[PDB]
Amino acid sequence: MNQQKSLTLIVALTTSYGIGRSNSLPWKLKKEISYFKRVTSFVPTFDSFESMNVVLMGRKTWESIPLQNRPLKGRINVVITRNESLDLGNGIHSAKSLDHALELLYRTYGSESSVQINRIFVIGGAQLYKAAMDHPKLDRIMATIIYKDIHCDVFFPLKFRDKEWSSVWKKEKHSDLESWVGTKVPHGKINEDGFDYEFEMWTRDL
Ligand SMILES: NC(=O)C1=CN([C@@H]2O[C@H](COP(=O)(O)OP(=O)(O)OC[C@H]3O[C@@H](n4cnc5c(N)ncnc54)[C@H](OP(=O)(O)O)[C@@H]3O)[C@@H](O)[C@H]2O)C=CC1
Ligand SMILES: CC(C)c1ccc(N(C)c2cnc3nc(N)nc(N)c3c2)cc1
Fold first, then answer.
1. Atom 7 of ligand 2, nearest CA residue
2. Can you list the alpha helix ranges (DSSP code H) found in 85-190?
3. Number of neighbouring beta carbons within 10 Å of residue 14
4. Cα 125 to ligand 1 centroid, rounded to whole Å
5. Residue ranges of domains in the chain
6. DSSP character for 28?
7. 3-class state of residue 172 by DSSP
8. Environment class of residue 58 by beta-carbon count within 10 Å: exposed (0-12), middle (13-18) or buried (19+)?
9. Pairing mode, strands 51-58 and 116-122
10. Catalytic one of 7, 9, 13, 32
11. CA neighbor of 143 nearest in space, from 124, 130, 163, 120
């Protein structure tokens, strides 16, 4: 009663795998954040009485969220840290690993609990994304590719869009992205702040 859901990773990255700078995001793309919130919050209409998605994030990512914005609303948040702890929040869940977070979640939101888990997302940062990529239950990446080599200081840890990984990681058709996300999703390049980005979905067989 532990390995019955697959994990999905969601990330916005440049073409050089850049994800962050100065402990935040090195762009401010309101439509991209709005895509993030929709994908991570979407629960099919039949289920959205009692079901919620989960966002799993590293301690530095938790600290990068503006104070007045965390925990991230309408999702079950869990912060991963090896220091139990001082953290903070709000009744905020924490765990010392991805698997400890899963155990915590299945124990807390058990078959009887009023709130039920729908999908579980890993939402960053690089260190946690590294652990997610090694996890046997991770099978899907929702990537926003940012077509600009923006200066970054933190990078996505595995070059999953590169030739060396292309027998393992496959890019899905846009209709399949829409069907998974449950809504119409812009197709191809969007321009905001004078650079182009686009939404992709990649999968790995379990
Ligand atoms: N999509 C995007 O573009 C995203 C970008 N970001 C960016 O990423 C940067 C944050 O990345 P990063 O510095 O790698 O930080 P993380 O958010 O991965 O925080 C790392 C910390 O979280 C804990 N942690 C992470 N992985 C594990 C693990 N497997 N087991 C136990 N503890 C773990 C540790 O906490 P402790 O030290 O407490 O033990 C570690 O010090 C920021 O710039 C942020 O803006 C973040 C999310 C999305
Ligand atoms: C605007 C506030 C609520 C906010 C601040 C930071 C973030 N982060 C960490 C963030 C922001 N955008 C993101 N975009 C994608 N595609 N994927 C991610 N994992 C991602 C993560 C999200 C929301």
1. 65
2. 98-108, 126-134, 174-181
3. 22
4. 4
5. 1-206
6. -
7. coil
8. buried
9. parallel
10. 32
11. 124
Q: How far apart are CA 100 and CA 52, in angstroms?
A: 19
Category of 194 on φ-ψ map: left (φ > 0), alpha (ψ -120 to 50) or beta: left
This entry's atomic model was obtained through: X-ray
Residue type, 204: R
Any idea of the CA torsion for 191, 158, 172, 163, to the nearest 10 degrees?
100
Phi then psi for residue 81, to 5 deg, are -150, 150
**Taking a C-beta distance cutoff of 8 angstroms, is the pair 62, 128 a contact?**
no
Q: Could you tell which of 81, 97, 144, 153 is best to mutate to test the pocket of ligand 1, judged by most ligand atoms within 8 Å of the CB? A: 81
User: Superfamily for 1-206?
Assistant: Dihydrofolate Reductase, subunit A (3.40.430.10)
Active site residue 13: no
- C-beta of residue 126 within 8 angstroms of C-beta of residue 155: yes
Cα–Cα distance for residue pair 143/161, rounded to 1 Å: 10
Active site residue 104: no
